[model samples]
Target: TSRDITVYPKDFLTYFQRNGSAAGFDYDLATYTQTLTPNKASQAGNVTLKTKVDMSQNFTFTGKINLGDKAQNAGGADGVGFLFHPGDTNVVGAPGGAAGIGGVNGAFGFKLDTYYNGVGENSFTPDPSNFKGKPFGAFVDGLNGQAKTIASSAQSISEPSNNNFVDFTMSYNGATKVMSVTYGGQTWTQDVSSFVGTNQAMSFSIAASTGAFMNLQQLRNVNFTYTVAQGTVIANYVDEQGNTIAQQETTSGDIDTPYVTSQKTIPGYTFKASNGAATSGNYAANDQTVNYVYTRNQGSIDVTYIDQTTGQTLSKKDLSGGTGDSSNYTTTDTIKSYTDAGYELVSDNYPSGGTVFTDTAQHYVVNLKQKLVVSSEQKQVNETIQYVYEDGSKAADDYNAPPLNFTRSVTTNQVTGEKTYGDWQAQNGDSFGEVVSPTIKGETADQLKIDAISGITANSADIQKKVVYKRN
Candidate 1:
């Protein structure tokens, strides 16, 4: 009855009987545009009576109803209808009267015959021949002797053309009696009211024929409408409500957007600090110290130092248009870091047994200044004595000897007149034979004074004064 049913191919026959039209009944009904005649027995068809179903829905089938034939033969009484059966082949022919119900049973079916069977008391029974006086109630299931026919009312009825419509309906209310059909027109079919049954899944179809022979059966338009339990909804893309939202577009490659805000902070240099005060062409840090800033120069650069503490400047002498070399100039600024002192003495080597002393080395600029002073002396000439004698006797002769040949000349103008001498060394004079033992002697001042006479004008010599220079 109200239980779920899963239909399968093997259960098709059982489902057909239990869920559709019942046995030994003329209860199924169908409506048609034309009625069948014995002369035109090949023509029997219906279109609007078809119904289509969605079999995929999981539901128990209630019942199925279809239209059926209303008359026996002649004057367009076809006495035929359709029933669905389970088999490997389709059985097409005329429907037998009472035994047509048996055509739908187990494994095989029959087209049935309302016409004849020769051995019967009437033409419709035992022999299946003799068409003229045949009863219209023969029911057949299988072929020949294997067929089973059921007895039923073998009468025919006539209805107005406008009242030719017939309806067959089966209801499953769980208990009670037989299933039935009503034949009518633009009128409604009355409910069977007697038979009650349980619900099951089913598939239904239609076929029809003339009472004497088979005919053309056609089906069409075939629309079926029914409510099925809905399934769970699958979500695609959605918002809070059950409405769909547009999916965000994705980028194919890397995406970058610059949004730099505050400027970068640079660490202070070791010897330079900036105060927080920022100004035109300079930067200051919180401590109020101005950091050094740089600009481009097109010509020769001049170097100078500014003492941040004192606000004093030390500038190169060349800035004042002086001629002295830059090596002779120095600024007064103190060293700012250990690097300003230049090379440090890492290690030293001295004579092993000798006293070691460390010289207080001058600063680079001071040493450079001393070197410039020594280089300036290259522009002046110097003079010095060639010899000095301890004894007066040899100097007189040497002076009078014809002045010894001069090796190189000295310009009197370039000479600076200042002189210095080296320490003296004694000689064991033995070169000439003038002495009594041939002993050579050094010169005295009086002999050198006598030798000086040759350069004076004749008889012009006179003693200017007797002076005592310090003696060595």
Candidate 2:
């Protein structure tokens, strides 16, 4: 049985280790710390979530985008913060007990705070209803009792309304100390190069209060890219599909294609002669070439011969063991009654062990002593007696209770069953046909059969065949 599930908040809690009601330094607090309020102006469907992904592996974070009404504002009076802690101490979520009201209980955070707490004064804190003059810059050691705003943004940004689009890129390099944020069709640029360093990871946050009117926020196709400087060395070589040629190596900046080497001279020259006739003086000539030159026409030279033996080839076969037949028989002795009678030999015995029986029995005892006579066997015997006793009494005084299983309380009618192709077709209609047609074409032949399938080809040949078939 397969279950199709799309888990959001629940799975995120499990993945980010943000669960339970712990007092201090808990990352799971992020789940309950932020409130998501629906904005009337932005579409009610405005919501987006992305997850743990490495950004520095590539040079650029690039993708497509479509606009939604709201902006994902992170950090502010709610103690929502960005995460950059290397160890496990960094956490998210609202504060617990009576300490969280007003500006008291701070959830260690980093924020792109649009809203402000009236406890401070700043430009980003345009509205005192949510945020009063709180800075939009950077804040540190936020949740340590006196969690004051440490940094504020010099410029204020409002939530984008209507069909406006933005492409944000945060680029940085630790070695060169360069960091920049670019927006608006590449015309507007903001560089924050002073803070570039060997950063371990990056995170952002969002928080809303109980009575606060939260703006609908969305983070879609959020991408990260990092630039690192390092030296690269490449080795190059050539391969020829022959044993006579040897591959050569050369170092370079990069090697991208296959190559072959120029021909080189062979190592040594050697020759051999064979006697062909007994009565007539005859010998085979050395026609082998070495060092790319023929050695057959060399002058008569002194040669030392090694000892060689000549004999006729012979073959033989033998079968010594006699064949036997299998049989069964019973004796008619009445010396003992049925009650006291012991089981007797009721089959004919073979003369001796055959090769099959000898081979089979040779290692049987050795294998049993090595593999079956140890801790595993003892454990198996113990497990057999563990279930019940011979007198039907439990061996132990008490049996521990198993853990309770919890199930989600879902409505019976709301529970979805397994989906089949027919079900999908009924739901999607013509789109199903469009999707399945391409899939059906893939099953026409297996990989092994394609080589001998004649008309089937690859690339332009296959495309040309499809065109021809379509024309017909």
Candidate 3:
């Protein structure tokens, strides 16, 4: 019966299972060594020791393998080394020339061939080969019962006089699909992507075989190191339209190397950066920054009115001259009251009405004008008188008094309709009769009337009179 061996650091004592004749291979736990085809006469056998760990990622293998006893004149067909198959079941190829590692389809191997067999055999031997008569390291690809040569050492294997050990190191890069081997101070590399697919699980194995008597193959200090897939990291920069502007790629372990301190600059806008999924800094997994967002600033508009004639800034009340001004005077504000108060709007700076504010300040100016003014004035009216004498003496029928001149200053308040007159004077006449009621124009009698008069005495050099009026 056959059983599987699960190999681990603590399970080395029973890590491998014999896959062939029990007498073909032996393990000594005290020395941690596996003896394949022991040094016994008439021995012709093959053996395979496989690891339980599945090769799911890129990995490395390092150890020492004894190609067999050269002092005992081991057969030239004897060999031993490491192998990798694509499944759980170990595939032990025909023993001897290729160390039981070659000739298995869909497999790979690093072989220490003690036998010197040219191409066309189960081993790899380059043409014009300097290593034709000595042991050498060989890399083989097992495809459909045939062993294809990938690489091999140019020089013969060193330290081949006895049954000594030779160090071997093999590494595989799953990403690049390249496998490399270092042996006897020399290294060889090959691209094996065609043989190893992206998702194949490989099983590691160590094998040995002999075609003649007294042939031996020994292995010790075997190790397997691997790295599982950790995936990748992606960083993206985008715009407001959810379109990617820039992107960066890295491994998941390099999340901190994605983006640094930066900013987006655009006029009249504010920008911010954040993770699209999380609320804050860079995400641990596959995530992206929010790109950017823009918002316009808000502002206010102010309106002012000035008088061109008086150089006085007109307040809302002064412009109205009666009622209170509204809270704001935009193009939407009314100027009807100012137009009615003997004033006409001349020019306006901002005629488009109030608008949404931005980074800039907004201002508006309005001008006004008054068309007419009203006041009071006084003038003189001249008259002539004729007198007849009743006595017998002849009296002249026509007596003429040159036009009597009277002058007075008049004042009136245009806004309140108040009226007043300066002292009134009479010329040529000795005295002015008691002043008759005065007549006023451009106003109603009830709104304006004479209040009193002074200097009506007889024979006065100059007669004076004054008048007062009030708004009704």
Candidate 4:
């Protein structure tokens, strides 16, 4: 029952138009009962029914047929059943005596024979008969001067008594070109590609004939089921290796074939299926596989600044504005501010403004330039001081390079003042008092200078032969 099934009312006569002698309301009963002469009787009648559904696709037909109360016929050819004609043509003329409903020139028939004639007619073959009863027969009429019997079976009862009903089922597979019929708890199958190819449409009809006496044939409970031609889709969740992690299947009916591409959900991964892109389409009669690929989410990156030469981690600011050894980071995360920590950026694995962390675990090396602390000792010197006049006049016996005597001392910001070897000089016209000088010179001392000096300008101060100056 995977196929879609459609049931018609028992009174389906309204759904179909009759072409020949036939009768029914809620049921189709062949009421035509004209007696004819034994050998000269060639008259036959049938009620043909056509369906709105096309039979070119895979389909099934099920119904009941009752060969009415039967009487004797001298020539012995009488039958009633279904005539399946492939095309729009109406049943022509009448059912022949040899193959009653089976007489259609270009159609297949499933007939319940009440009697049998010696010679076959149209597609029905040599009459397989029993004096005790008649057999059900299947025939195929190519309508092209070619016809034959496909299969048949003998009935247990001689004739339908009290209008007994016989159930029948017929199905055709367009893909396999196979046709099957089931009746009386028996089934038969055949490959009918030559007689009824896949592309041909089919029509239906009910037929009956009696060469001798009154006989009735009735049909009811007709139903049809079929599946339209369409494609299938397989949705699968797969890993990078194409191994299936999960799977689902659906037909074209549930959703349109060539389904659109979409994303799938996995606990910790992102998934994409169908084509390389995230969309799907172009589904037809073929099978398709939709692949789902997964990727892990990106993790956090840990960064630690270190002294490259020492391999020791440098102090860095943490997220809480406190100092720490390592900081949490992610893709595109910037390096922490470090310049104010008395360190300058030296070398790093990542660019200053580049994205270093992607969808994977990553480590970053940040090299820092350590600051150097300089300290030096103060130096002391002794020199002579002399005074001069603004008008180019000097005291008696004052030398051009006056002997400026004073104790010279060099000093720096260095605490706990210490003494170191160094030379110091004071510029001409320089004034000094108890104040400390800032300039000094020495190979090792970072800052060395004279603290105080006197008597170098014409402003006139008493010349001192010897003076001690200290620079700190």
Which one wins on lDDT?
3
Q: Residue by residue across 1-472, what tens digits does model 4's lDDT show? A: 2335454554445445544445322232443122111122343555544332244567787776665554344334466655655544355324543443344555665555656555755544555444333545555443453334443433333455565567878888776767777765767676766656553445565566655444555555666565533444566677666766565544343224346644667654566435432246765433466667765444445556776545688643233211222334332223334455444467677444534334445566677755443434332232433322234343223222333333334433222234343343443334444322222232122212324565553233543442222323
Q: Name the better of 2 and 3 by TM-score.
A: 3
TM-score of 2: 0.25
Q: State candidate 4's TM-score.
A: 0.39
- Tens-digit per-residue lDDT, 175-229, candidate 3: 7877788876878777766766653445556666555534556666766565422
> Model 3: clashing residue pairs?
none
| Poorest lDDT segment (10 consecutive residues) of candidate 3 | 317-326
Q: Cα RMSD to native, each candidate?
A: 31.8, 48.5, 19.7, 18.3
Highest TM-score scorer? 3
Task: List model 1 lDDT by residue over 71-102, tens digit each.
Answer: 22423333333332222122222233322322
lDDT of each: 0.25, 0.25, 0.51, 0.49
By summed lDDT, the worst window of 10 consecutive residues in model 1 runs over: 366-375
Ranking by TM-score: 3, 4, 2, 1
- Per-residue error (Å), model 4, residue 268: 72
The Cα error of candidate 1 at residue 271, in Å, is 90
lDDT value, residue 112 of candidate 4: 55
The C-alpha stretches of model 3 lying farther than 4 A from their native spots are 1-10, 21-26, 41-56, 71-77, 119-130, 151-155, 227-472
Model 2, C-alpha of 305: deviation from truth (Å): 90
